[PDB]
Design a protein around this ligand. Structure first.
Ligand SMILES: OC[C@@H]1[C@@H](O[C@@H]2O[C@H](CO)[C@@H](O)[C@H](O)[C@H]2O)[C@H](O)[C@@H](O)c2nccn21
Length: 300
């Protein structure tokens, strides 16, 4: 229903819109690393998220380092499973080249180009696909103008040779928080968005103001990862500040994906250790974070 109705997504005047030009807001879940918690990524769990939580997008977080794709490239087949499930379930899907410790996206740029060539050749004639080419550039030696923008200007042409206009999300500096610099020096492609990520354990008022600054430059922003926890993925849940962010994103109509769908013993994890990897969870099988996120997507 979702993808048949909204169809081809694009950016118009800095906003995500459907094929009629109407604003659309995606809300869903991210996997944890596919090399660690891939058992939670399958048609049945994704169908349960669609039908019981109301998700309309799923993010496949393919770590590059940390035992991910560079170390063992077999994980790309789990990305394919997730994309195919999203096609069968008629929801959108984010293919996330999940850099982190490999903090400069240029470290694995050759591999990224080959990976995104393959994915865009396979799936570029479906409207479901959204490409997230570098999760979180980070480090004071990795800047938008010197490192990230030029990386994007090599990977985007590879994708565009196979897929002229599905959405591309491009990470920003300082762990995808520095939307100000990106918004002042935007990419040319008209169907790009810039990633902004937050974790509710950080007091967020200035970060919200910086998102507004970026929006005011005509940059489109996708909140492709956020958590209810501290920035470590743990440290308790911060539901008061998470709700502030939820309301802010609704007012600005910003799409989002929550970190993350796993039973790992950390506060941002949505599931408790007895949750079935194929779905059907009871309330007791959701964590405090998962209960809250589920409520947010169902309310929507
Ligand atoms: O630390 C929380 C998350 C992080 O996941 C965290 O990665 C760590 C390192 O791999 C894992 O040990 C944690 O279990 C996971 O929650 C995301 O990979 C990253 O994009 C991000 N940036 C800011 C926070 N986070």
């Amino acid at each position: 229903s979702v993808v048949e109705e909204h169809g081809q997504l694009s950016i118009s005047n800095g906003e995500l819109v459907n094929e009629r030009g109407e604003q659309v807001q995606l809300k869903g879940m991210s996997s944890h690393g596919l090399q660690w918690y891939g058992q939670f990524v399958n048609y049945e769990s994704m169908k349960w998220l669609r039908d019981d939580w109301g998700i309309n997008v799923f993010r496949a977080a393919m770590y590059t380092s940390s035992g991910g794709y560079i170390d063992d490239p077999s994980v790309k087949e789990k990305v394919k499973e997730a994309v195919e499930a999203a096609i069968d379930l008629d929801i959108y899907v984010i293919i996330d080249w999940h850099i982190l410790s490999d903090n400069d996206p240029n470290i694995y740029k050759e591999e990224a180009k080959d990976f995104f060539d393959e994915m865009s050749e396979l799936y570029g004639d479906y409207p479901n696909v959204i490409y997230e080419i570098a999760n979180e550039p980070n480090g004071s030696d990795v800047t938008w103008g010197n490192q990230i923008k030029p990386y994007a200007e090599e990977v985007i042409p590879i994708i565009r040779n196979n897929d002229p206009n599905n959405i591309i999300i491009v990470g920003t500096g300082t762990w995808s928080q520095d939307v100000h610099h990106a918004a002042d020096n935007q990419l040319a492609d008209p169907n790009v968005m810039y990633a902004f990520h937050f974790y509710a354990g950080t007091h967020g008022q200035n970060l919200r103001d910086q998102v507004d600054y970026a929006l005011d430059q005509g940059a489109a922003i996708f909140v492709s990862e956020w958590g209810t926890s501290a920035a470590t993925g743990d440290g308790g849940v911060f539901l008061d500040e998470a709700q502030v962010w939820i309301d802010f994103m609704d007012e600005r109509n910003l799409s989002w994906a929550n970190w993350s769908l796993t039973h790992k013993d950390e506060s941002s994890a949505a599931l408790m250790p007895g949750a079935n990897p194929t779905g059907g969870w009871t309330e007791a099988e959701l964590s405090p974070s998962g209960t809250f996120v589920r409520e947010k997507i169902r309310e929507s």
